[PDB]
Design a protein around this ligand. Sequence first.
Ligand SMILES: *[C@@H]1O[C@H](CO)[C@@H](O[C@@H]2O[C@H](CO)[C@@H](O[C@@H]3O[C@H](CO)[C@@H](O)[C@H](O)[C@@H]3O)[C@H](O)[C@H]2NC(C)=O)[C@H](O)[C@H]1NC(C)=O
Ligand SMILES: *[C@@H]1O[C@H](CO)[C@@H](O[C@@H]2O[C@H](CO)[C@@H](O[C@@H]3O[C@H](CO)[C@@H](O)[C@H](O)[C@@H]3O)[C@H](O)[C@H]2NC(C)=O)[C@H](O)[C@H]1NC(C)=O
Ligand SMILES: *[C@@H]1O[C@H](CO)[C@@H](O)[C@H](O)[C@H]1NC(C)=O
Lengths: 45, 48
Amino acid sequence: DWCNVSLVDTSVPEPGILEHDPFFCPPTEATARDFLADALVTLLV
Amino acid sequence: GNALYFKSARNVTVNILNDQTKVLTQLITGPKAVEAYGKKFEVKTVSG
Ligand SMILES: *[C@@H]1O[C@H](CO)[C@@H](O[C@@H]2O[C@H](CO)[C@@H](O[C@@H]3O[C@H](CO)[C@@H](O)[C@H](O)[C@@H]3O)[C@H](O)[C@H]2NC(C)=O)[C@H](O)[C@H]1NC(C)=O
Ligand SMILES: *[C@@H]1O[C@H](CO)[C@@H](O[C@@H]2O[C@H](CO)[C@@H](O[C@@H]3O[C@H](CO)[C@@H](O)[C@H](O)[C@@H]3O)[C@H](O)[C@H]2NC(C)=O)[C@H](O)[C@H]1NC(C)=O
Ligand SMILES: *[C@@H]1O[C@H](CO)[C@@H](O)[C@H](O)[C@H]1NC(C)=O
């Protein structure tokens, strides 16, 4: 059938990260103190 | 007018304890995986 003869040639058909930033959540930094020496002073006076 | 948050620098290990302080169901939202341990799961709609 010559009517459905198809010819095709070459053509030019030419058509991940994860991150979220919150603002802050710092813990108790510099965790050290004492309430004896000052108590000793104010109970030694 | 505000959004209640929960944050940490590490895992959020939501869990449940029985009277013997033993874990039955758990929901650990970690950095990479969101695990839901337990004896089941469900998703329902409003009508049931
Ligand atoms: C879940 O709830 C929170 C709090 O209601 C929603 O956050 C709100 O998001 C809107 C839309 O961006 C913020 O409005 C605008 O935000 C920009 C910053 O992106 C700011 O520059 C503008 O001036 C304006 O405020 C709103 O501020 C923000 N609220 C808070 C407290 O941060 C969030 O959108 C809700 N989730 C969904 C899916 O709607
Ligand atoms: C915070 O959550 C993450 C994500 O769920 C946890 O990471 C996972 O932790 C499990 C248990 O520690 C790891 O299983 C381990 O596998 C090794 C073999 O790879 C095995 O030898 C160990 O005995 C244990 O079964 C799993 O690999 C690990 N996965 C990833 C991607 O990190 C993490 O442990 C949680 N941390 C805390 C403090 O809850
Ligand atoms: C190609 O074949 C189909 C199916 O038989 C037919 O419908 C169509 O008319 C044919 N095309 C031509 C140009 O004859």
